[PDB]
Design a binder for these strands. Structure first.
Ligand code: MG
Ligand code: ZN
Ligand code: ZN
Ligand code: ZN
Lengths: 49, 49, 192, 477, 44, 115, 254, 240, 34, 66
RNA sequence: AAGACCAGGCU
């Protein structure tokens, strides 16, 4: 949270449809705390047998 | 017996699993409550991705 | 005291009628946006056929971006000027901007005419994907729509891609506001 | 891809990507990958057809559901780095049809562009008509909007619970609020909002409120405070006991009234409790006695709502007490719309002093027009107009983001049919003198939220109070 | 003391130092009845 | 917690004089009337009635602070006429008008009810 | 230099609503009359509440607030009652309060709606106005609600529960002849129901010598007082306030 | 270790010597009040009751101080403490102690903060010396600090959940210093850029423009009302 | 068989069906169950 | 929870109209026709019945104390 | 008692 490098905080193009672009906290965690999109689903994993 | 594992609410091993609206109301549990959190020492704890 | 108590009589407000312009002004704005997009298309086609001559001291990419930015900025300024000219004497946006209380001519232009180009790190919207901005656009697309130029206004509403590009644009301002404070305070303390 | 769409031996979990230029083919079954569903497009036509929609419309008593839709090869899960090879169409009716073609190799189509928003951002009406910083501010403030958080709140024993008297579902709604269950647990009230400079008390971000409406229960709420207390043993005969002290026969000499405690040292519910009142008389036998009794938070000025006595893990006596206080909105209290327009209450005027229309309607909330020009929240105005149309029509307006079937001219044309000025303006009369106001003020119903931050929880004063032990300086907090 | 039980709503007669289990059902949650002394509200 | 009680809008706290009369030294024949526990309802009435008097040169009222319940009225009259007399005459004229309006409203109600 | 000679026409008169027109009077007079319609008209409302048993799902002061917002028939006795601060007795008596008692228990399985019909008063003149029924609370089987309430006399300045009115419509100069409002586009504004001009023209021509002269009213009663007597009570109260000023200012002159 | 005790921020030197927590300070939310002067501040009664100012008994004010002591800490205006010449502190808040309520010249009576007191008022980012100016206390109902809106731009404050700090000087000498040096009207023009700091803002500025156009014609009663709201008016109505 | 600009009904029907099957916290419950 | 006794804006009693409104909506009246039939002319009273959410029904599902 | 972590607000 102390890193002044802006790059990881910016809204990346690949967040389209995955992470809400509007919803982030203010202050020291801008862009570092992200909320899930409505239709986003996180994979649970499987064996590649 | 090797230990106790906390249980995520409304999971496959929770006691609320598969209960209906009437059962949840009889148990004083809101049907609209999504679950997905733990109860540790009476407090509700949510794991952040 | 005296001027608030007089304002009790005349009153002040803001509304939708303050942000809706004339149908002729709308037609002029659409025509301007059309010629501007056609000009950017012509510039892109000139670069594609390698007819564009590089400005001294500047790379071909730099001069291409400079020309496109020039065209889009001229378009946005012309549309804003037309929208400001279309304003009536009763418009509350004009009444607020002229007195200098709050708002500005660019705010009026973005409300009525064109939100304008969206920029990240002082540059046009980058290629977060391999050679494109979003999966809706084709690869190697340097046109205004693909690179973050918002054709619509706030009153008309934004398309989904323009909305996402505007969110990207506002994120930069939020980050800068959140970041600059520590350095500014440290400089102030060291000076004191 | 065929096997994945037939679900045959490849789970829809699995992502497959072919990078042609680098000649690589990557397959991921790994966990933790974020993905979203998309419609498959074959040639220029969707694979979703009218029979699928018919079966899904008869979803009840047909055991046909989203899993059956997936098994038919109509929708597909696609993750982030597979999108690099995906050609997406924003909508079928407007990018699949033949034009002077931009593209013809579309492979997928979005369900609806409004699905790119989160839970808190899906309650914003007309989010595409606002500035993105204001959308972020509303997304942050919606988590602080007060309402009915859970239906069984009377059973729960929680600290710092806020509940609202009369939640209302919004008159202007988003299509995705049905899936967020916002109707069942609303977090605000539709209020008549006039955007005008009335007396200068709404300047900056402040708000003027109608005191008569507040007297009628407008934005009234309840705050519940919970207190935990534990009987325990530690030493060989050091033990804590719930009992009613004699005030002067214990080490804690203070002025407070112990008369409210019962035989077991617990205040019964229904007893008004003020500052310094002892809710739980607990004595620790000093190997005389030490007073470890608990007090109310200062000036909480509440009423005991519920008292509970149980046994903990170990088996000692355990007590929970829930206190309620009602909180009527005051000057310092914080109110916000769904557009980032946040503000305290500058002043409250009674119904007699509020401006009124020809029909006797007076606004519940008056906000300064200067909040609009710089912040550029036009969605606020569009919501106010759509709500004015909806309250007369009897329907609930649709403010879903990217629907082209709603625009401001159409809303104005609908409003003009009810005897109102088509842009929402209305002639207001001065409350003090009865004279007309020269300008016509924009008025209408808008959804407003009361926020957790109140002046009663923030006001603080100090004069030679407690002193820190080590620095001999005033305490923190 | 009269303690309403948390599961079966039967009141229990019970006293100090008694271990809390409801006589009917063994449940461990009790609630104190609203006191008898009266509290006056304004209808504002 | 700092909310004043509901009755300070309309009810004297004991020791307050309902009306206080102070001479204005800035201009001759000018007076300042302080009405406690009143609001616009009465001040606007009195000001509007005072503006009809041809012998009144100035007539105005204000609430010094909305959170306080107090009216200030300034009346300036011609040299041979006292602002006290102007105030009393305005009040009497207002009462006479209200009485006539009440009587005519009652007559209208009776005519409306029995056709 | 003197009072008006105003006249009253009454156009509509029902049990809910009174539309009337006041001619030949000042605008400040009319505004103060419509303001007294709201804030200075006395009525009877429940003010003191004691709850004995409340096992409903709504808390004690929620129910007390709802009880206080229930209108009571104030037609006869509101002139007879004293203000409690003016009453000579120390404690609630029929000259300064009305006692109400509520005692409901839900023994039946289906939910019982406790309504204003369940309020019982010591005297027959001051029943709740709705006697469909105003819903106070809903009771599940086994739930109980018993309480006492005393009603006092007050007006809208104290609290909105003492507001006798359900909105006062007020309007003057329907055709904008005095130009007190300026329409940027007069053709876009719907015409008032009192307009006297043709369907083709938007506004009356400007009248530099005119002053506001007809006031159109529409007083809608909430049920406690009849709309006919609301206006009379308001006029009497305003006259009494002016007379009290006259008296104390005569004293201050002396 | 001791190095860690002294080294960083919140260490001894920076956290307890260069800056430290103080007494006689208050914090709450700020709300606008256009009826106040630019040097006035609205103060809730609860804060003014808690905050006290020590005042020295003289033959001029002995009667008023005795009245305050009789009021005590229960009624709003009275005293909280009486300090004898020997330094003994008598507390009036618990008991009437009627033998101790005697006052004589030389005593110090800690009265409750009243109208006219001088207070430093501060907004925390504290970027320039106009971020802390001395105000004059006016006591108002409810629980918010109230200030004129032209004063907002010096503090960079807006009424959207903003809280501001209030420091009350405890000595006559520091009161004179604040009055003569840091009062709001003395800080109108900044030495930073030789420009005024306060200006006409918001509704009033827009109304200024709309009021000063040529088309504005005001009728007689409107003129008399507007003149009633003038404080420096000489009382002569100008010829129209 | 094509949906002929009935699309506003169709897409919200399929979205309803999706949220009726899964809901909002499926990633939590699925992760813990697995 | 439950229908407010008074409309907040004007003060008309809307507390006795919730059951009738529900009955009309059940009798195939639309919301606009039902509101017109009940006599709620201006939008301030209409919004009361149109935007009300009756949570008291949900609260009555849970079993009570005693 | 104190320390630690977390969440949030105003610039
Ligand atoms: Mg702020
Ligand atoms: Zn039991
Ligand atoms: Zn009596
Ligand atoms: Zn209404």
């Amino acid at each position: 949270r102390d890193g002044k490098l802006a790059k990881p905080r910016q809204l990346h193009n690949t967040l389209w449809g995955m992470v809400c672009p509007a919803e982030t906290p203010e202050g020291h965690a801008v862009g570092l705390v992200k909320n899930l999109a409505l239709m986003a689903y996180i994979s649970v994993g499987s064996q590649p047998s | 017996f090797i230990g106790k594992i906390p249980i995520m609410l409304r999971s496959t091993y929770c006691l609320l699993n598969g209960l209906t609206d009437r059962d949840l109301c009889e148990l004083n549990e809101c049907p609209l409550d999504p679950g997905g959190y733990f109860i540790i020492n009476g407090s509700e704890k949510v794991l952040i991705a | 005291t005296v001027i608030n108590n007089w304002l009790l009589i005349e009153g002040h407000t803001i509304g939708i009628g303050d942000s809706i312009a004339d149908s002729k002004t709308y037609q002029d704005i659409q025509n301007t946006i059309k010629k501007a997009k056609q000009d950017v298309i012509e510039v892109i086609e000139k670069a594609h056929n390698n007819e564009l001559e590089p400005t001294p001291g500047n790379t071909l990419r730099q001069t291409f971006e400079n020309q496109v930015n020039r065209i889009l900025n001229d378009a946005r300024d012309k549309t804003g000027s037309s929208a400001q000219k279309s304003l009536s004497e009763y418009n509350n946006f004009k009444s607020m901007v002229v007195s200098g209380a709050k708002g500005s001519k660019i705010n009026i232009s973005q409300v009525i005419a064109v939100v304008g180009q969206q920029n990240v790190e002082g540059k046009r919207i980058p290629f977060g994907f391999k050679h494109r901005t979003l999966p809706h656009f084709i690869k190697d697309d340097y046109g205004p729509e693909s690179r973050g130029f918002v054709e619509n206004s706030y009153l008309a509403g934004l398309t989904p891609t323009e909305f996402f590009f505007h969110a990207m644009g506002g994120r930069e301002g939020l980050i800068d506001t959140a970041v600059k404070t520590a350095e500014t305070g440290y400089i102030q303390r060291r000076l004191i | 891809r065929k096997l994945r769409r037939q679900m045959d031996i490849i789970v829809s979990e699995v992502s497959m990507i072919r990078d042609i230029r680098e000649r690589e083919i990557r397959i991921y079954t790994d966990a933790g990958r974020i993905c979203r569903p998309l419609l498959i497009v074959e040639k220029q036509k969707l694979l979703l057809k009218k029979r699928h929609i018919d079966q899904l419309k008869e979803r009840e008593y047909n055991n046909y559901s989203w899993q059956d839709l997936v098994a038919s090869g109509v929708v597909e899960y696609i993750d982030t780095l597979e999108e690099e090879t995906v050609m997406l169409a924003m909508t079928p009716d407007d990018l699949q049809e033949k034009e002077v073609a931009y593209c013809s190799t579309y492979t997928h189509c979005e369900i609806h562009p409004s699905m790119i928003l989160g839970v808190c951002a899906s309650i914003i009406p007309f989010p595409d008509h606002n500035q993105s910083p204001r959308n972020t501010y509303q997304s942050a403030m919606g988590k602080q909007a007060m309402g009915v958080y859970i239906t069984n709140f009377h059973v729960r024993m929680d600290t710092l619970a806020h509940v609202l008297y009369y939640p209302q579902k919004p008159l202007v709604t988003t299509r995705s609020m049905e899936y967020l269950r916002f109707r069942e647990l609303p977090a605000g009230i539709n209020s008549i909002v006039a955007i005008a400079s009335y007396t200068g008390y709404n300047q900056e971000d402040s708000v003027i409120m109608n005191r008569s409406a507040v007297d009628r229960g407008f934005f009234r709420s309840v705050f519940y405070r919970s207190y935990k207390e534990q009987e325990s043993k530690k030493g060989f005969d050091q033990e804590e006991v719930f009992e009613k002290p004699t005030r002067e026969t214990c080490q804690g000499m203070r002025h407070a009234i112990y008369d409210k405690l019962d035989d077991d040292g617990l205040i019964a519910p229904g007893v008004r409790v003020s500052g310094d009142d002892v809710i739980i008389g607990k004595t620790v036998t000093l190997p005389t006695k030490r007073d470890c009794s608990t007090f109310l938070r200062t000036s909480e000025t509440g009423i005991v709502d519920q008292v509970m006595v149980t046994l903990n893990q170990e088996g000692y006596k355990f007590c929970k007490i829930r206190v309620r206080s009602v909180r009527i909105p005051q000057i310092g209290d914080k109110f916000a719309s769904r557009h980032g327009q946040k503000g305290t209450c500058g002043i409250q005027y009674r119904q007699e002093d509020m401006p009124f229309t020809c029909e006797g309607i007076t606004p519940d909330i008056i906000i300064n027009p200067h909040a609009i020009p710089s912040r550029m929240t036009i969605g606020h105005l569009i919501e106010c107009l759509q709500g004015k149309v909806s309250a007369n029509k009897g329907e609930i307006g649709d403010a879903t983001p990217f629907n082209d079937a709603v625009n401001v001219q159409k809303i104005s044309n609908l409003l003009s049919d009810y005897g109102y000025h088509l842009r929402g303006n209305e002639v207001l009369y001065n409350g003090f003198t009865g004279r007309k106001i020269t300008s016509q003020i924009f008025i209408g119903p808008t959804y407003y939220q009361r926020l957790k931050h109140m002046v009663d929880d923030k006001i603080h004063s100090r004069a030679r109070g407690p002193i820190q032990i080590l620095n001999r300086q005033p305490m923190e907090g | 003391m009269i303690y309403i039980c948390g599961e079966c709503h039967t009141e229990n007669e019970i006293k100090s130092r008694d271990p809390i289990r409801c006589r009917e059902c063994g449940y461990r949650i009790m609630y104190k009845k609203r006191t008898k002394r009266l509290v006056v509200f304004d209808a504002r | 917690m700092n909310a004043p009680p509901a009755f300070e809008s309309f009810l004297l706290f004991e020791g307050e004089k309902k009306i206080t009369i102070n001479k204005d030294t800035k201009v001759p024949n000018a007076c300042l009337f302080t009405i406690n526990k009143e609001d616009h309802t009465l001040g606007n009435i009195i000001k509007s009635q005072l503006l009809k008097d041809p012998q009144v040169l100035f007539a105005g009222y204000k609430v010094p602070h909305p959170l306080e319940h107090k009216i200030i009225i300034r009346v300036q009259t011609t040299p041979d006429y006292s602002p006290q007399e102007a105030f009393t005459n305005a009040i009497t004229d207002l009462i006479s008008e209200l009485s006539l309006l009440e009587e005519r409203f009652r007559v209208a109600i009776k005519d409306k009810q029995e056709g | 230099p003197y009072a008006n000679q105003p006249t009253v026409r009454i156009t509509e008169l029902t049990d809910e609503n009174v539309k009337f027109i006041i001619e030949n009077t000042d605008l400040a007079v009319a505004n103060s009359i419509r303001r007294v319609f709201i804030a200075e008209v006395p009525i009877i409302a429940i003010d003191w509440v004691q709850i004995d048993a409340n096992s409903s799902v709504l808390h004690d002061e929620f129910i007390a607030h709802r009880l206080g917002l229930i209108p009571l028939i104030s037609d006869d006795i509101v002139d007879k009652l004293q203000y409690s601060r003016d009453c000579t007795c120390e404690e609630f008596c029929p000259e300064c309060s009305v006692e109400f008692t509520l005692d409901v228990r839900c023994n039946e399985d289906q939910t019982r709606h406790v309504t204003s019909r369940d309020l019982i008063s010591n005297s027959p003149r001051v029943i709740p106005v709705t006697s469909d029924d105003i819903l106070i609370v809903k009771l599940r089987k086994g739930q109980e609600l018993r309480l006492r309430a005393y009603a006092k006399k007050g007006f809208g300045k104290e609290h909105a529960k003492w507001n006798p009115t359900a909105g006062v419509a007020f309007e003057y100069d329907p055709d904008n002849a005095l130009r007190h409002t300026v329409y940027p586009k007069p053709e876009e504004w719907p015409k008032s129901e009192y307009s006297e001009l043709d369907e083709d023209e938007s506004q009356a021509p400007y009248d530099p010598n005119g002053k506001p002269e007809r006031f159109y009213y529409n007083v809608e009663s909430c049920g406690s007082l009849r709309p006919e007597t609301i206006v009379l009570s308001a006029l009497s109260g305003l006259k009494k306030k002016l007379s009290d000023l006259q008296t104390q200012l005569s004293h201050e002159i002396q | 270790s001791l190095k860690q005790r002294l080294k960083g921020k919140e260490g001894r030197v920076r956290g307890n010597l260069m800056g430290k927590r103080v007494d006689f300070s208050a914090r709450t939310v700020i709300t606008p009040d256009p009826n106040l002067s630019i040097d006035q501040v609205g103060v809730p009664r609860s804060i003014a009751a808690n905050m006290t100012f020590a005042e020295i008994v003289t033959p001029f004010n002995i009667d008023r101080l005795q009245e305050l002591v009789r009021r005590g800490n229960s009624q709003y205006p009275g005293a909280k403490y009486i300090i004898r010449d020997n330094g003994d502190r008598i507390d009036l808040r618990f008991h009437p102690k009627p033998s101790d309520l005697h006052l004589q010249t030389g005593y110090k009576v800690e009265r409750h903060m009243c109208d006219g007191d001088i207070v430093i008022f501060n907004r925390q980012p504290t970027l320039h010396k106009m971020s802390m100016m001395g105000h004059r206390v006016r006591i108002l109902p409810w629980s918010t600090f109230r200030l004129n809106l032209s004063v907002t731009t010096p503090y960079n404050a807006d009424f959207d959940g903003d809280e501001m700090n209030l420091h009350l000087p405890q000595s006559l000498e520091t009161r004179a210093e604040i009055q003569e040096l840091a009062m709001v009207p003395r800080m109108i023009v900044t030495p930073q850029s030789n420009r005024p700091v306060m200006g006409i803002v918001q509704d009033t500025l827009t109304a200024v423009r709309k009021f000063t156009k040529r088309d504005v014609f005001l009728e007689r009663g409107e003129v008399m009302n507007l003149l009633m709201f003038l404080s420096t008016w000489d009382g002569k109505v100008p010829q129209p | 068989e094509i949906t002929p600009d009935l699309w506003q009904e169709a897409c919200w029907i399929v979205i309803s069906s999706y949220f009726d099957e899964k809901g909002l916290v499926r990633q939590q419950l699925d992760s813990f169950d697995e | 929870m439950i229908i407010p006794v008074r409309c907040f804006t004007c003060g008309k009693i809307v507390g006795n109209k919730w059951e009738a409104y529900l009955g009309l909506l059940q009798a195939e009246y639309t919301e606009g026709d039902a509101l017109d039939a009940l006599g709620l002319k201006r939008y301030c009273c209409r919004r009361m019945l149109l935007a009300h959410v009756d949570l008291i029904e949900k609260l009555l599902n849970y079993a009570p104390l005693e």
